[PDB]
Amino acid sequence: LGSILPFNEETADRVSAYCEKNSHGIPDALVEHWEWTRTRFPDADKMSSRLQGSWMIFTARDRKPKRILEIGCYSGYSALAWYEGTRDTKAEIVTLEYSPKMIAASREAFKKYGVGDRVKLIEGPAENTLKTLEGEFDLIFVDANKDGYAGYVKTILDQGLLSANGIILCDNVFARGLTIGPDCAPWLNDHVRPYWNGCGQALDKFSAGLMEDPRIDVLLLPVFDGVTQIRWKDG
Amino acid sequence: LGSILPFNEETADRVSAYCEKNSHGIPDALVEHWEWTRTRFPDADKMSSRLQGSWMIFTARDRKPKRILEIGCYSGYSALAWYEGTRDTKAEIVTLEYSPKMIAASREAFKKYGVGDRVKLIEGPAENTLKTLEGEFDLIFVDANKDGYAGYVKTILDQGLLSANGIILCDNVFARGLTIGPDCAPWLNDHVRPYWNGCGQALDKFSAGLMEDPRIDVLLLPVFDGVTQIRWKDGAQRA
Numbered sequence: 001l002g003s004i005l006p007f008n009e010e011t012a013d014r015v016s017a018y019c020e021k022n023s024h025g026i027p028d029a030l031v032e033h034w035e036w037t038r039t040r041f042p043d044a045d046k047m048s049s050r051l052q053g054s055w056m057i058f059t060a061r062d063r064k065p066k067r068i069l070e071i072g073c074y075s076g077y078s079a080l081a082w083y084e085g086t087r088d089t090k091a092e093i094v095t096l097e098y099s100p101k102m103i104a105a106s107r108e109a110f111k112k113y114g115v116g117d118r119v120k121l122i123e124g125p126a127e128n129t130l131k132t133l134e135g136e137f138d139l140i141f142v143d144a145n146k147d148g149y150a151g152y153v154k155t156i157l158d159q160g161l162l163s164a165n166g167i168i169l170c171d172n173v174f175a176r177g178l179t180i181g182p183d184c185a186p187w188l189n190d191h192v193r194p195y196w197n198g199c200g201q202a203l204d205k206f207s208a209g210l211m212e213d214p215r216i217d218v219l220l221l222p223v224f225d226g227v228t229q230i231r232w233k234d235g
Numbered sequence: 236l237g238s239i240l241p242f243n244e245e246t247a248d249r250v251s252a253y254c255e256k257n258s259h260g261i262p263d264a265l266v267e268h269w270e271w272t273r274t275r276f277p278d279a280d281k282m283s284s285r286l287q288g289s290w291m292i293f294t295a296r297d298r299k300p301k302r303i304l305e306i307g308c309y310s311g312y313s314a315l316a317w318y319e320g321t322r323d324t325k326a327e328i329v330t331l332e333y334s335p336k337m338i339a340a341s342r343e344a345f346k347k348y349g350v351g352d353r354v355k356l357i358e359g360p361a362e363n364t365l366k367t368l369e370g371e372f373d374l375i376f377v378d379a380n381k382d383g384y385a386g387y388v389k390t391i392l393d394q395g396l397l398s399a400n401g402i403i404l405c406d407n408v409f410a411r412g413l414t415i416g417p418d419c420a421p422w423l424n425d426h427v428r429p430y431w432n433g434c435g436q437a438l439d440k441f442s443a444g445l446m447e448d449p450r451i452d453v454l455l456l457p458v459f460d461g462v463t464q465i466r467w468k469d470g471a472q473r474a
């Protein structure tokens with residue numbers, strides 16, 4: 001017996017709606033931004049869900065990080081969630097993105113919502129820009145190109161960008177299930193199958209690699225699209 | 236469309252095994268206790284999985300709670316997970332249990348494991364013993380009678396048994412899916428369906444009640460059999 005409840009599509013969606021209804025809601029402005037994003041961009045399925053937004057805000061309010069690093073900004077949704085979750089502490093948020101279209105999208109949203117005082121967006125290939133950062137981050141959200149995750153984590157660990165009591169959260173580790181195998185998401189539309197299959201293989205390599213690193217404790221949690229939590233091994 | 240990936244039974248089990256393979260495992264001794272529990276008891280399905288064990292240990296090492304409270308000990312598996320996760324700080328672990336059979340099992344288990352004085356099993360109906368507890372806990376794991384969760388959380392908040400920065404984790408809140416609706420777990424064994432439907436009705440009332448409590452932030456996490464995370468609202472924290 002396993003640790004994951006089996007649901008069909010309709011029922012998964014019902015249970016997700018139930019979780020939303022019975023969890024703290026995200027702000028109206030964030031809902032608005034989520035819908036705006038889905039209206040403007042054909043690849044908006046890359047953006048985190050509403051429930052995931054609730055999770056980001058809860059996690060930031062709970063952990064109270066002093067500085068947050070995000071890799072993969074897209075339209076700025078998850079950055080706005082980190083911002084909401086850190087209103088009390090006024091945490092610095094750094095987010096990395098390489099697409100001009102999405103840079104423009106994000107700066108537009110940040111101006112509209114009034115979050116530029118704490119959110120810093122750095123434009124460029126994250127594999128390069130990540131290395132240029134200094135100091136440390138208490139919470140790091142890795143959510144960019146899947147085939148880059150290993151490199152990102154390597155940089156983060158090698159340069160000490162993760163604070164002693166910090167956590168790394170890696171998103172979409174399951175690649176809709178295809179990380180486990182090409183046969184693990186029959187419901188997925190064939191049109192996006194190549195992409196996600198590509199991500200799956202990469203994310204499998206990544207996952208296996210984490211288990212070979214004596215510096216860290218690793219937990220792959222079967223929630224959302226798969227979330228890997230990484231921390232420094234004690235002490 | 237939402238946040239949860241749909242899996243059929245076989246595939247869900249493969250994905251669980253994948254998560255285990257790709258997460259740090261529980262200590263050998265704890266595996267031995269888990270296996271022993273499954274051999275000893277016919278109702279061992281009440282026990283958490285191995286992956287959940289890794290999650291408990293990770294969570295404890297991460298949050299570094301000073302004291303941990305647990306409601307529902309069963310055979311001691313989750314208590315020993317918390318124990319493993321707090322070896323460096325020697326956190327006090329209080330665990331509440333009412334079944335004579337499981338109390339005997341757990342005390343023997345704790346002695347075999349060689350836990351110190353820091354693991355404390357309190358016998359009796361948790362609804363009454365929980366009120367007798369003093370001080371505060373940084374992590375509280377609710378895993379007892381599903382129809383009691385609301386009452387437990389109420390006591391916990393009313394008496395300030397949760398620390399300012401503490402968290403409550405409530406397990407099995409989905410009741411296999413039946414908390415959401417009686418048609419949400421067609422795979423479920425019919426023999427345990429009435430039981431879990433009862434649990435689901437109680438847990439649905441529980442979940443709705445949390446949303447009305449102005450003291451707390453709530454996140455119902457669609458992981459395992461449903462895990463409700465509860466914290467004080469920033470403004471509701473007290474000195």
Ligand SMILES: Nc1ncnc2c1ncn2[C@@H]1O[C@H](CSCC[C@H](N)C(=O)O)[C@@H](O)[C@H]1O
Nearest residue numbers: 047048072074077078098099125126144145
């Ligand atoms: N090498 C790279 N460097 C920087 N950004 C990258 C990259 N590869 C991909 N990206 C960006 O990573 C993003 C992934 S989607 C991010 C979603 C966002 N975090 C949310 O939750 O909504 C895309 O915007 C993409 O352009």
Ligand SMILES: Nc1ncnc2c1ncn2[C@@H]1O[C@H](CSCC[C@H](N)C(=O)O)[C@@H](O)[C@H]1O
Nearest residue numbers: 282283307309312313332333334361379380
């Ligand atoms: N009212 C009550 N007071 C105290 N314990 C109770 C109770 N109702 C049920 N229980 C106990 O709660 C336990 C739930 S199963 C707990 C499993 C354990 N936490 C693990 O993860 O392995 C059972 O052992 C049951 O006997």
